[model samples]
Target: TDRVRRSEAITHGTPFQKAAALVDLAEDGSARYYFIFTRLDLIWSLNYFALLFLNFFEQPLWCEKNPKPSCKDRDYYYLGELPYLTNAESIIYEVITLAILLVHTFFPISYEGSRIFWTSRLNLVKVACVVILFVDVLVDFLYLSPLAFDFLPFRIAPYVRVIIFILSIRELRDTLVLLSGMLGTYLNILALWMLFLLFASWIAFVMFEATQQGLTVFTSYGATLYQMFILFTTSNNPDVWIPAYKSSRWSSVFFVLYVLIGVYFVTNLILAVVYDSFKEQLAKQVSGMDQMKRRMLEKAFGLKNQCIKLFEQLTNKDEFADLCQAIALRYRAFIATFITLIPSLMPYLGTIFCVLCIYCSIGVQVFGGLVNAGNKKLFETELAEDDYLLFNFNDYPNGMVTLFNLLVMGNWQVWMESYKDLTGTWWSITYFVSFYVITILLLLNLVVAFVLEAFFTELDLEEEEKCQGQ
Candidate 1:
């Protein structure tokens, strides 16, 4: 008889008796699943298998350097040398590769499935992204370029490092954007310059690694630096690096100048480009939405031509004509909503970009102008005196506000004239009232439009009655 099928007899047992039996079975099952040795054994076996497979394709130069003493067997004999290649290593490498591949293949599906399984949660993707990020961090810090000499055949084998490095560009761009927003242009420029320095350093490191592989003295550190310099300077140089001991004084001079110009000047110029591009993209999204609204309004009103004759004929106390006029105006309001909201949201939507741009313009214009102005002589004649001076002493205090308004509003004169000070009646009542009333009315209009849409959907009910009357 099955254990679960014997429920009638199980009902006679005492609570303690039943609990004891269940606990015993549960403990035994849990112990088997949660055993530390089981997990450790799996990890060890996987690593062992991967190492074994990787050893088969590795160059024999590794085996010649690392002869194993105790394990005279060919499979495990050559894992200790310089290149550290062996059959055991091959197995271990393959096993790990397969395991990682399996993880990559299944994890994303498992992650997405959990979200669907658990109340449509989004935490699954979040967790997966975080885990992937952690893995990337570990790979970068722990195993970045194990001397790329462990190649199967090629001397200067390109490690998987470059592909991984390139994948990080998105993260790098995000970081740059954030830093630019927080610290402004100077620090942003500084950060990008440091990136260029790091890239040069990595290139130098790779060249050094290649030289150590016994290619040629031309592959020496000095040669590597010379070549990088040549590349940086001429930019069109066919030969990337010079051989060691080759004197190229002109090339050396070109390299030094290139560093100053490229690293410091061109890199900062790139930041400016990125900033401008970001501004353009933001403006495009906002303006695109605004244009869409205009198109929708044109379509809605274009139907007015068909109804124009009917509207004119029913002008005398006609409810149908009144309804048509109300609807046309409502359509106009819908269009107006898009136009007004786009401008209103500009302050909040593009807050970061606008603020950074304003700060950069102010710092560059005023401070730069002052520094440049100090080099010039003051005017002598009365007519020339006032003409030479950009502003009078009394105007200096207001100029700060003037510049600030110009940058933010994009039109200084228009902004200043219509601008109400907080102390004014327009600011105290009209501004606050207008803002709140517009917001409330916008929501009210949205609700009315939705209800009207639903009513129109139900208007199909009149089709049957019209057919019966006909």
Candidate 2:
């Protein structure tokens, strides 16, 4: 039975392995089996990368001791000091990075490829890397670009568009699979609920920890809620106003727990369900194949069924082949054009022209401040005794606290250190609302893809029949 088929059931160690086995079984064994698994894998990968890219650059400063020099001309320019990175080393690294990127782009590799038995795992990693790189390039150009004037044109709207695209891909899969009669409408409902739960959990966790950190902006319950909203929606400002909290330990603890639940548990659960659904599809295919074989045998023995048998054979022959080839060629041409267009517009033209300038400025200033603070602490010498002096602990906000409030809320594992004052905080309603809106938009797109696919599949089948009749 197609429904009960499990060829590589034992290979469940990693996504790559699972993907490889799935592709191998589907392509080599059955088309129906392959299509179902393809839908699931694509959906799972879509969600995985969306989350990763959204959270990738959420954090700002990473260095503790020696920060890199800031751009002397700009207040925002701050460079982080990467140890062992001399001028020559930096140049070599850039060259190597570009070369590697070029190689990976053209020499396409599949998870089920023979060179690696466990290549599916590598495929997932590559998928993750590709998605991250796409976001990085976008961020570098639109938000992080050095040319301050360029930021206004491609600002928040572009990021929002990208997020919507990511969500749409997943939603489309959900709609298609559910409507196929293979899955129930409840899966769609569960998808909606999951979106709510995921975003709500993230906001709740953020507010809970922020209150503990005693962020001033978070002192008023409403204000704290607003800041959490800003964090989720991807705010540009780095100064996430914190009240006078003693330590960040409580906030950090809460963050860690949220990450464990949100990233490790809930996300993985969706992937697991997709895997199960894929198995069901394989079984259905096997059943359909059996029915086809039975029909063929029945037709061959009966004179009245002879014409019907001839029709089926002709319908599935040269006509179908030519039609499929045309469709494949069209898609290949479109995808090739898209790939070429994306790079030209992204990190190259948009990033260097805009993002690098801003990043350079921000990096330089941040590095200088840290250097000054360390010098004051270690040498006990006051470099600048003013309100904005680096040594004055009571005057300016702590770097760790600032970084946590601004960039590290969602992704950083050490967030549990800031969750002390959980009593005053609840979920940020604004974040919940924004995320819900995004999810719904994506769901709408998914419905569209499903309707389109169904229409086309039937239309193509009809066209094939007409061609055979002629």
Q: lDDT, candidate 2, residue 309?
A: 35
**Which portions of model 1 miss their true places by more than 4 Å?**
1-85, 110-267, 270-470
* Highest lDDT model number: 2
By TM-score, how accurate is candidate 1?
A: 0.20
lDDT of 1 by residue, 1-470 (tens): 32432232224444333332232222222232223333445564454344323322444332233433322343222122224335455445534554553443334345345445344433444344435544543443343256633333221111221222222233333323333442343445546644664566455546345442215523555444434433443342433335311443343453455467764676446545444544554456558655654444333333364356434422312443234335444374455455555554333333333233333233222221221122232223221233322321112222324334433433222221122221223332333223222222222222333344334434553556668899
Point to the candidate with the largest TM-score: 2
Give the alpha-carbon lDDT of every model.
Answer: 0.36, 0.37
Worst 10 residues of 2 by lDDT: 414-423
Q: For candidate 2, lDDT tens digit of each residue in 1-470?
A: 32323333313323333333333333333444444555466544544444323322232233222234432212222222223334354334434443444344223443334455235554455555555555544454344345633333222322332333333343433334333553453376457545655565556545655454444444554554444434433331334433222354354454445445544664455444444454465457568765654454333223234334333332313333333234333374445444554542232232221222232223323332333323334232222322223211111123223232323233221111111111123332332243233232232233333344445555676679889999
Count residue pairs with overlapping backbones in model 2. Answer: 55
Write down the lDDT that model 2 would get. Answer: 0.37
